[PDB]
Symmetry: D3
Subunit: 152 residues, 6 copies
């Protein structure tokens, strides 16, 4: 949907525990993306098994699920042009060792299991993840007055 | 409840529009309070009339309600010692003209109608506001590992 | 003029030298005031003797003038409600020893001679200072799109 | 001129509108470059047609000129070693989608039409741009006391 | 000694644990004070009983000593005009509930037992504390090039 | 030693002079590494000749040694997984002209002689540098409570 593209972001429990929710939000705000959904939730194992369904035969899958249910996450939807790809970029490589400073993981994380945040890896994944984590009435349209200064 | 005291905060639509959600969250995080609930909602006029029920005979009540329903707000619950009173302090006086720099309003706001954020003004108000805006299953207990360094 | 009130600010040479121009500007921006004039100039002794004409029989007047002409200053005009009084507040007491942290002087300055910035001390002073330092065609009207979120 | 090299920077109207002037200035300050000229101006279409003369057969040229005249810009000259090339780097790729986080565009911009700032693309361009936008008596020499700690 | 006045600061173990050492240092740097001594130490109970000798009949004394020996502290000496009194101010009231936002405790602390930092409360205390915690050859004179812009 | 790896960092005198000690510390803190040693020292020429022993036939060696002894440095040891390599990365290329924004040198430095900080370039170098600059009883173990949220 061009500038109506959406991605799903989740601050993982390490993010909440280390108090970096604000910091992360702020990076998306100042980049100019539009916050259209935000919930602090304790994810169920049922949901997380579906979230991570593509990773079900990998050896990390049990621990990854038990982890993401271990604490509160902050679930989020961000809207704007190319937001999925750009989010991946702001966040940085999956392994923080490969995430250059300036990215969230580059700045704040050391190890791949405690890398602070999930972002949808494709427009497809975002559609699925958004529907899985959020009811349609939790996604907000609002008239974004900043948008005259972010888009032509 | 001592260190289990809770207060309700809401970023008003100006806060969302001006992109200060992250900024505000970050101030509460770094102060050490524990985020126990968070959503982005479009508040109904029905809810807001109950929220602002103590102010129903003042002349600004209608416009205040029509305002807070004008856009998305970010509703929030924060937990910690004396959190209600301390929140009021971080936020600053209701009229920003009286809010000393260092406070959120002192730093970011000019006029009382566009003062960015609501905080519960008493323990009583917080009880009511929390119940009004949030179901009990939206408030999260999580084992706060920072708390050994915030409380004796 | 209400929300059209204007004040004159000058980053003094210490501010420029210590690299705090951006920092200071940013505080005014984020407070919500509207930047309507800005130049980097070397003030002449003639101008500064008139600028500081109220202080001409104090013993320190010579040194204050020779100082402010010692380097580049950043001259500025800021517009908004109560901007003169609020600027005085953001800046802090004239002697930084009396300027509480959170204010510019409270955060960045130690001694009264090197207190980083001048702000008009009254609406009267601002009228005079603005005319003294700036031609009318250097003050800009621009359609401030943030203003819907700072004023009612 | 080595460490006397100069580049022309302009905060575009989006930068002013979004209140990022201070932020941008501050990045140049803290990098260690020396601010030698600064004004807030409303650029004329005549000037901007000459400024963007190299881009006169591109399809974006009309809209780019009408844009940059649409609002106030902050025009700037920065001095230091390799300042032109390094400015290009701090700013980031022309298309923000290609600008890595840590750069100004990477951090703050989404689309190429609203990319916040112009920087001279060569020493040649800077010479021309500086003369076009600034009288010689607007460029200041000042004894930079930080410079002992930026240059060997 | 005027502008040669010195105070002793210690980031307490909560400050180290919560990762606020840099943050605290930065506040003193940007205020303009001169760092003349710095080490990370594990304080002995013997030292701490002497450090807190003024507080020996209060009921909190045992726990305060066992606490400050519980972890690493960052010991510091800062030099400049009125630095003792001004430090007390930047830090904020002993009980953070009384520390206004903008101060370190106001911004970062909730409870008096975990208030992040100690600062000498008098010139006398600073003399004693500096000698107790630091050898004379750990205090550095260095030619402070910023000082021409902090003092007249 | 895995997550017990250590690196030696030194803020060079330019760092101290330009007041960026806090800033630098803060970057390491927020990345999650563990500060295990810290002092402000005036390095002797004898020590620095040993520190820079690998560079003894290069033409810059005399000036490099006379420089690093010219003022106070802040010596530091940081512990965590891959801390040596990651420190190199946070710091940026040796020549700041090649250091992308987001890195310390990319953000703060212009020229190679005044590039603010040294970091060990290998685990080997760190072992040597740590022993050269620090007694064993200056390196602290402390029970890092943040570590559950940085490592699995």
């Amino acid at each position: 949907t061009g500038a109506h593209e959406r991605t799903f972001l989740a601050v993982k429990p390490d993010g909440v525990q280390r108090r970096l929710v604000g910091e992360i939000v702020r990076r998306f705000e100042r980049k100019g993306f539009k916050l259209v959904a935000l919930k602090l939730v304790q994810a169920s194992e049922e949901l997380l098994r579906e979230h991570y369904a593509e990773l079900r035969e990998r050896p990390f899958y049990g621990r990854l699920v038990k982890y993401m249910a271990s604490g509160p996450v902050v679930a989020m939807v961000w809207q704007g042009l190319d937001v999925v790809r750009t989010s991946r970029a702001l966040i940085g490589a999956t392994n923080p060792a490969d995430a250059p400073p300036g990215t969230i993981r580059g700045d704040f994380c050391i190890e791949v299991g405690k890398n602070l945040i999930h972002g949808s890896d494709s427009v497809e994944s975002a559609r699925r993840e958004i529907a899985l984590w959020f009811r349609a009435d939790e996604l907000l349209c609002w008239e974004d007055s900043a948008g005259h200064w972010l888009y032509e």
